[PDB]
Amino acid sequence: PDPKFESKAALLAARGPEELLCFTERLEDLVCFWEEAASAGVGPGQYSFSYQLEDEPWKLCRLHQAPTARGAVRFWCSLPTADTSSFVPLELRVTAASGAPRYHRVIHINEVVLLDAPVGLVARLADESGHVVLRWLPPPETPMTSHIRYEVDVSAGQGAGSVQRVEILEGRTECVLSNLRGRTRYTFAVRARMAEPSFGGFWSEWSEPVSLLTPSD
């Protein structure tokens, strides 16, 4: 439907397509999908998706077929809000008309969190030394911001062939790269992932890059 989803669903397609890929953007939702190009056969009623939250009744999810760029068709199921309980075991059951079981998996909407990319990043010289202070804003409409860790990226060229990484402490949304190299124009961008054990999911889309040029030496 929305680019946000397609583009966010690509990151996962490269993580095991012939497996059910679910993920929650803000612990208040859940969607599972899987791709497969097919024959003129595959259509509306050809697959039945069913889920069940711990010791409760089973419920059938309406299904959503859609044609992806790579030609394949996409099937997805946005769980009904009333069933996005995090910390509660979710068992997923898929099936094709006849009665063949394609995928079966048990999860927790809280261990598959794929967060929107961070926002508000901007660099700026450390008035107290040849470093770079990096402030930024976690993802919007996203809870548990105190449970999100950030990985920063440091690039001196898409062809400079020389980079450097860093991991930020859950909660901290600012860091200064002290040990660096001057009179050089660097660029940075950050991604965000929830913090285990409590949570878990997948790295977030990198943020818009940002550029600056350290003083001298």
Binding site: L53, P80, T84, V88, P143, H147, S198
Partner: protein, 154 residues
């Protein structure tokens, strides 16, 4: 081996959701009526006694309370479904609650809120409106719940 409910933050999410549950039902007019009692638990705390209580003894007060509430929300979402004009805004919150309780009822079962329930030891309020259901909602959450988890989280 996580008794998750204890991580202050993990729980704070709900309390803050209910703050939104409320903050919306207030600006709510006639379209927040329940057209039925809906028995909710008693949310008022009297520290000179609670402080005097015992975890175990509180626990029950809470477990039972949570339960009853959970029956409500459902009953709310319910009466809200068959409704002609379901104030979309109201909808969402009514749902998050439904789920919130589900996740909570679990994290408590952890601590041992149930085991510390049907152990033979030594009220009625009713929301004729949603505006109140949510009020009564958070008040129990940050109220008795939040006050129990603490002492019990050792």
């Amino acid at each position: 081996p996580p008794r998750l409910i204890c991580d202050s933050r993990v729980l704070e999410r709900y309390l803050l959701e209910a703050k939104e549950a409320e903050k919306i039902t207030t600006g709510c007019a006639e379209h927040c009526s329940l057209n039925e009692k809906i028995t909710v638990p008693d949310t008022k705390v009297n520290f000179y006694a609670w402080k005097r209580m015992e975890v175990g003894q509180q626990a029950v007060e809470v477990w039972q309370g949570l339960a009853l509430l959970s029956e409500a929300v459902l009953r709310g979402q319910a009466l809200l479904v068959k409704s002609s004009q379901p104030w979309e805004p109201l909808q969402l919150h009514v749902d998050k609650a439904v789920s919130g309780l589900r996740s909570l009822t679990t994290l408590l079962r952890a601590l041992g809120a149930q085991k510390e329930a049907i152990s033979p030891p030594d009220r009625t309020i009713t929301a004729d409106t949603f505006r109140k259901l949510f009020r009564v909602y958070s008040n129990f959450l940050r109220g008795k719940l939040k006050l129990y988890t603490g002492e019990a989280c050792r």
